């Protein structure tokens, strides 16, 4: 019962890996680990065994990722919506998480060996207090570790994460750390649970569903989406390989669209700021332009004072986030 198998790639897996690694490779892949219960019914086994096998496949898939040089992975492990399942199944999932997390602690120091950082993202106050303590110990121990990153989304939905990010920024203006005008797409990005990682290059959902089910909606707006029919506990290296092949095919147009979005956003921001500086210069009676370069220094100070407030807000938010007596 461990978080990552230790197997090396076979000849054909290794060969195909070398080939695609000549092209652009994803740095961060997100997985919606869907189909555990259908898998259990197909193999005529209990639902708890389908979920346990699902965890085993997660451990195996992380080893594939590491063997492919993909060093950050985010997985959907428990939705807030999944609290609506039967107590029998929910208790089974909570028990599984309790047994995998503690076991991570027994298997600790081996996490120090491979530099594995474990983060658990979601509205964790809805979990059993004992499970929160096991989870809290997890992030505490594996913080400051560098070689790879696993983000487990537990008691998570995207709407709840986006709502919390807005609440965080609202808390900022309530504390005098932020002006409501400082709120921006970049700032909301830095208030998500995922704020320590780049947006996923690939979002993979198994079992043939073509929906996102409230997962990383903000972060995957420009991610390559891969919907594969295989049920999660039957995921293979070749399913993962196919998803990466999809990513390489999309990469040129996708990075262009990503850059064009960013260039348009930064630009529309410049025009809003120039317009605001103009409004302050329409008032006070000064000129719209002149050799004195007045609007230029007003623009410089507007953004610098904005960046100062933002940097100060993020540090207080990070300190509040690291303020935990829960571990």
């Amino acid at each position: 019962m461990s978080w990552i198998k230790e197997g090396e790639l076979s000849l054909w897996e290794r060969f195909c890996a070398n080939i695609i690694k000549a092209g652009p490779m994803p740095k961060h892949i997100a997985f919606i680990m869907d189909g555990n219960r259908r898998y259990a019914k197909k193999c005529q086994v209990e639902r708890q065994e389908g979920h346990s096998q699902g965890f085993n496949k997660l451990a195996e898939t992380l080893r594939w990722c590491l063997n492919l040089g993909i060093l950050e992975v985010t997985v959907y492990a428990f939705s807030i919506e999944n609290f609506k399942r039967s107590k029998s199944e929910v208790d089974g999932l909570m028990d599984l998480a309790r047994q995998k997390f503690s076991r991570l602690m027994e298997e600790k120091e081996k996490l120090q060996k491979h530099g594995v950082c474990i983060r658990v993202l979601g509205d964790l106050h809805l979990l059993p207090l004992d499970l929160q303590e096991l989870i809290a110990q997890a992030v505490q121990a594996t913080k400051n570790y560098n070689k790879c990153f696993l983000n487990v989304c537990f008691a998570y939905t995207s709407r709840h994460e986006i709502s919390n990010a807005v609440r965080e920024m609202a808390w900022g203006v309530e504390q005098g750390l932020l002006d409501p005008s400082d709120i921006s797409e970049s700032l909301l990005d830095k208030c998500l649970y995922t704020n320590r990682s780049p947006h996923p290059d690939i979002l993979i959902r198994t079992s043939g569903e073509v929906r996102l089910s409230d997962f990383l909606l903000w972060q995957t707006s420009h991610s390559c989406l891969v919907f594969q029919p295989v049920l999660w506990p039957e995921y293979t290296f070749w399913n993962l390989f196919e998803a990466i092949l999809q990513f390489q095919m999309n990469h040129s147009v996708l990075q262009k669209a990503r850059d064009m979005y960013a260039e348009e956003r930064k630009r529309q921001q410049l025009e809003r700021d120039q317009a605001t500086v103009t409004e302050q210069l329409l008032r006070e009676g000064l000129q719209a332009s002149g050799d004195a370069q007045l609007r230029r220094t007003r623009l410089h100070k507007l953004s610098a004072r904005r960046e100062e407030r933002v940097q100060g807000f993020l540090q207080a938010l990070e300190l509040k986030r690291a303020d935990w007596l829960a571990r």
């Binding site: 939705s79 807030i80 919506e81 999944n82 609290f83 609506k84 399942r85 939905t157 995207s158 709407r159 709840h160 986006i162 709502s163 807005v166 609440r167 920024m169 609202a170 808390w171 900022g172 203006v173 309530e174 932020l178 002006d179 409501p180 005008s181 709120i183 921006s184 797409e185 909301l188 569903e209 073509v210 929906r211 996102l212 089910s213 409230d214 909606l217 903000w218 995957t220 707006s221 420009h222 991610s223 390559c224 989406l225 891969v226 919907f227 999809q246 999309n250 147009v253 996708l254 669209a257 064009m260 979005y261 348009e264 956003r265 529309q268």
Partner: protein, 201 residues
Amino acid sequence: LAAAHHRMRWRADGRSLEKLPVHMGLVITEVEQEPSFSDIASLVVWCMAVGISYISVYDHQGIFKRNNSRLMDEILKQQQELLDKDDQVLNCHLAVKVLSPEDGKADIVRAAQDFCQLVAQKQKRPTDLDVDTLASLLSSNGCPDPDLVLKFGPVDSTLGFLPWHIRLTEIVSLPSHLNISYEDFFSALRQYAACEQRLGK
């Protein structure tokens, strides 16, 4: 009177499905230099004919938003052909929205600015912004979320289409909107009608 028969047939087609989308998004991932408004307009007219209440047209470059008049002109053209201009014009503007990237993340940021402004005016509390209140605050208002998106073209991405609203949208991909046929459009509807939505249960 032959237009009444065509309306009857399309109504029967929509009614025959196990379920119909209330709000469909059309995401064009590749718009050509001369945009194919006639193909988009036909998709929109088919949606309205089969009984879909709302249609959102979307491209990442904002071409349809910057050509909104030409698009509605072509929609109204094909709405009369093979199917009181003011009522027809008003009904298309109620049912059809032309969207661009700023309707997604930028609008969520707009809502966050508005709400934080109330916090700064001591009129609301940070804890007052829950999931349901934020949804009310977006410029989607009472409009239902998209339940089906038809994604056209070679890009395997939603490209910034209403991220908040597509938490449960079914995303059906077709290769091209160009010379799109009613049978191909309706086959996409059959796929959505047969999908199983469990809502976490």
